[PDB]
Symmetry: D2
Subunit: 257 residues, 4 copies
């Protein structure tokens, strides 16, 4: 496969609907060796089952709010892997009120802080902690959304955080690029996941993209997963600092008229 021998750490695999699950499946298919993170003790058994499905027992806790856990993640991983070839950041969070209704109604300093801390800061934070063990041709991938680019109803504070995340892709690409490391995002179309269900009226977004995207269909975690596997691979060695849309072309139209 086109990821033969590549060692890839995946965050964010919460359920079999997770974007990270689709990425994991595609990476394993293409020959990668995988490792996984989780948050919260009650999820240890579930993530362990997922890891086993992908031929791995490499599972580590990491709440990205916590500097100590970020450092311990890579210390733990290093006991197994001398080097890391891929990193998938598939992590986002905002308090419920910050992704519902009017943008200002749900804006507080703490809601802003938390959304940006978990959804944006954590990506370059993981990159920095990983750097001593990154291979020279390593590839780092995050997940963003069109809400970064244009105002989407209810997405609100997450739109600000995704914009900062996409900027971090560019600044990371410069910082890490001379070494040879690539950094990219996929701006995924709407997919029904646990996180997605936190956005007020997500169902309306899903239906609108199905009706108005050029391909007249929503994307799947398999499609995002394949795009992800591509970006993580040497097939994409010419590509860095890129935000690739995998959204059935929806970003490129003015729909619904």
């Amino acid at each position: 496969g086109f990821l033969d021998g590549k060692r890839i750490l995946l965050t964010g695999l919460l359920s079999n609907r997770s974007i990270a699950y689709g990425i994991a499946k595609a990476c394993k298919r293409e020959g990668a060796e995988l490792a996984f993170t989780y948050v919260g003790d009650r999820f240890k058994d579930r993530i362990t089952e997922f890891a086993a499905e992908f031929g791995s027992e490499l599972v580590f806790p990491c709440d990205v709010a916590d500097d100590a856990q970020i450092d311990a993640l890579f210390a733990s991983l290093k006991t197994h892997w001398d080097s890391l070839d891929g990193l998938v950041h598939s992590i986002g969070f905002a308090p419920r009120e910050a992704i519902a209704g009017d943008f200002l109604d749900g804006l507080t300093r703490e809601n802003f802080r938390i959304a940006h801390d978990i959804s944006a800061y954590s990506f370059p934070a993981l990159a920095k902690a990983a750097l001593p063990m990154l291979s020279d041709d390593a590839s780092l991938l995050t997940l963003s959304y069109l809400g970064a680019e244009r105002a989407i109803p209810n997405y609100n504070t997450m739109g600000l955080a995704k914009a900062a995340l996409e900027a971090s892709v560019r600044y990371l690409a410069v910082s890490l690029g001379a070494k040879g490391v690539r950094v990219n995002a996929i701006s995924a179309g709407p997919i029904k996941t646990l996180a997605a269900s936190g956005i007020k009226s997500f169902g309306k977004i899903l239906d609108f993209v199905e009706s108005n995207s050029p391909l007249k269909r929503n994307v799947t975690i398999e499609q995002v997963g394949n795009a992800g596997a591509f970006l993580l691979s040497d097939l994409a060695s010419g590509v860095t600092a890129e935000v690739m849309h995998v959204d059935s072309g929806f970003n490129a139209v003015v729909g619904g008229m």
Copy 2:
């Protein structure tokens, strides 16, 4: 003038080189009534002199890190003005190490938090606190930089914060737009100000833009000020959610080759 009768509050007027000074001068010329904020007791006398230069004694302290001071700002202003027609957010801050050298070297959770808190969150925070007194045709203006759009050497963590700021312009425009309120940014070219001098190798950016911009010259606070006055006025009643470049066209080229 084209701002006759308009009541405009300006933040960020630190010295006569400040972008806010240029905006103040243009607004006063076009007939606006002005009020000003400052941070730090040692600046009270200086900002009072500036206010007097622009025919006003309306000066208020506001450290945008502090929720209480934000609320007290508008309570104080309200004792003078029943309504507010314009708001100029000309405020940015990042710790020194976060705007020098390598992006990851200067990245910490706290540096990230502070840069985003002061440079991005504070804009919609002021908008929310101002809303009860905003006139229906009020106009809110912030200042951004090209570092939001593309990676610029040393700008680093501020690039992430400006990207979030530009997203906030769009989400603010939606929140406030039905009332009739407009929200925009100017993405200014490099100007030698106190804040600018915090960026490592700012002089190199200044010289490069002078040599490679389409107009082969750097912008001035007078030029940014006039663009600002325009956006704050009813001349611009068709314009919202816009990030207007005032940078001699530099953003639009690939220079230096």
Copy 3:
């Protein structure tokens, strides 16, 4: 006014609904001296009346399909004005089938050629013919549409031509910038004009922008006109190579969901 003494040539003033009419009205208000072009002998009397309304008898024929008429335009204008300070290109055309229904159904080599010739090439063509008489601080303005940036139903071949037009703004800005000349576009929201009525289902676009723009209202030729007058003036001396949206913020959202 902020255009005192400025001599500005306006193309495209077909009726009192034309975008160019709004620009003319704003420019005259701000003190400019105006001159006008027209196409087709039956329009001589109408454009002459418009010119008189704006205090001018300077009217010249110019079909931009014709190199000879472009050259004769500036030779004629030069008999009156030693120098030209502003140029408004408010000209677009595509064959009916190229702006209706499916994009490929209406695509032919000739439809493509004509749409790009009249709608895109003509702008830098006028700039080149005008250059010997342009003042050093002259300002050139064209009108574009969001269809350049994203696919809009029915806009079709005009979307390609507007994309080329917006690129021409950038290349013109570089060519003319060292002299001091500025070049910009306004990307206007939908306005019911004669040209607009050629687009299939224009009414649907108009209604959608009214309902989904941040300001919940369509723009007027007065709003576009004021933005235009600003860009043509020394107020905008810091601005070149810019495509400014004047569309009630519509470009910045994902609406209709």
Copy 4:
């Protein structure tokens, strides 16, 4: 391979330095069956050798300036293939003076017409002629350049044509998307090819991208080829209307300062 069974027609394979050669090599590796076009009788033997290298004798003349040759191309191809799964448009041309020196100096109506006819119109023209034989999951790919997005020295008239080309990707994606067909571009970094050598000071662009791109290296036809093969494949079934940069991240920075 990930293109097993896919039948792909490639235009533009002129020499072993051509971008199309890199795409051909990657597609063959991944299991595709290939067919090729050429222009000019003196090239028949050369393109036939290339086709043989990729296990094919399917070679057809097509000058995209000529409607009859475009129609005869697909009639000829149809005698061999019932359906077409991929189309690679790797074709660009502008008269020498239109890609050298000052933008206006090299602008004529005919230079404009020719550059847009061959470099932009020809892509949707091929798509339209191919449509009756396109499979439902076919993928169409064109090659663009950063000169579409920002002004690059000497690229001049080609910048306008590439902007129109990128718009055509979006309008094609909408037209063909309901059927299931995807349409994308790769915006490639500078590569020394025969066409590239027509651009004045191409060597300077090549050197600048090597020094200032995030990866500090120029891209190769192998890297562009792999990205191309990906986009042509079912791996990319979630991706349409996309302009993917394969340029070592150069587009994403402000370099040379």
